[PDB]
């Protein structure tokens, strides 16, 4: 009831204020909206190995929300140092006992993640492969990022 009330406003705000290319819509018993399960899409930033790719993730809110952050998973999982092999996104703003704030909008989340894509947080890696290649062979790293950007290019 608390989360739903706040999530209803989030969808309201989003509809009238969000970046081009981004997508944040709840899932669907049919016809009825599931405000606790959002299907999202994040375009790669222009002028990066990520540009041209549309990386889709799932945004899972709890009834604990907004006290607690949503859980964000890339589906399929992404090659990236701050994303668990399960697809779970590791972002400081998505952690209760850290940088998360009740005020944080879905917009800020999807943008926060978009910056994370091209600017990994070496401090706390979740993925062993991505982290390694990132720390040693950047050229090959970015070669694997562009190949992925194409795999997830629309159409």
Swiss-Prot record:
Residues annotated as catalytic: 90
Location in the cell: Nucleus; Cytoplasm; Cytoplasm, Perinuclear region
GO biological process: cell division; chromosome segregation; mitotic nuclear membrane reassembly; modulation of chemical synaptic transmission; negative regulation of DNA-templated transcription; negative regulation of transcription by RNA polymerase II; nuclear export; positive regulation of canonical NF-kappaB signal transduction
Record-marked site positions (Interaction with RANBP2): 2, 23, 54
Cross-link (Glycyl lysine isopeptide (Lys-Gly) (interchain with G-Cter in ubiquitin)): 16
Positions of modified residues (N6-acetyllysine): 62
Consequence the record notes for mutating residue 45 to A: Slightly impairs binding to RANBP2
GO terms for cellular component: cytoplasm; cytosol; glutamatergic synapse; nuclear envelope; nuclear pore; nucleoplasm; nucleus; perinuclear region of cytoplasm
Annotated stretches, region: Interaction with SUMO1: 11-16
Glycyl lysine isopeptide (Lys-Gly) (interchain with G-Cter in SUMO2) crosslink location in chain: 16, 45-46, 98
Effect of residue 84 to A: Impairs catalytic activity
Molecular function, one GO term: RING-like zinc finger domain binding
Gene3D superfamilies: Ubiquitin Conjugating Enzyme
Database matches in PROSITE patterns: UBC_1, UBC_2
Pathway: Protein modification; protein sumoylation
Effect of residue 39 to A: Slightly impairs binding to RANBP2
Distribution of this protein across tissues and organs: Expressed in heart, skeletal muscle, pancreas, kidney, liver, lung, placenta and brain. Also expressed in testis and thymus.
Modified-residue entries (Phosphoserine), positions: 68
PTMs per UniProt: Phosphorylation at Ser-68 significantly enhances SUMOylation activity.
Domain named UBC core: residues: 2-154
Quaternary structure note: Forms a complex with SENP6 and UBE2I in response to UV irradiation. Forms a tight complex with RANGAP1 and RANBP2. Identified in a complex with SUMO2 and UBE2I, where one ZNF451 interacts with one UBE2I and two SUMO2 chains, one bound to the UBE2I active site and the other to another region of the same UBE2I molecule. Interacts with SETX. Interacts with HIPK1 and HIPK2. Interacts with PPM1J. Interacts with RASD2. Interacts with TCF3. Interacts with NR2C1; the interaction promotes its sumoylation. Interacts with SIAH1. Interacts with PARP.
Family under the similarity heading: Belongs to the ubiquitin-conjugating enzyme family.
Name of the protein in question: SUMO-conjugating enzyme UBC9
The organism's taxonomic lineage, starting at the top: Eukaryota, Metazoa, Chordata, Craniata, Vertebrata
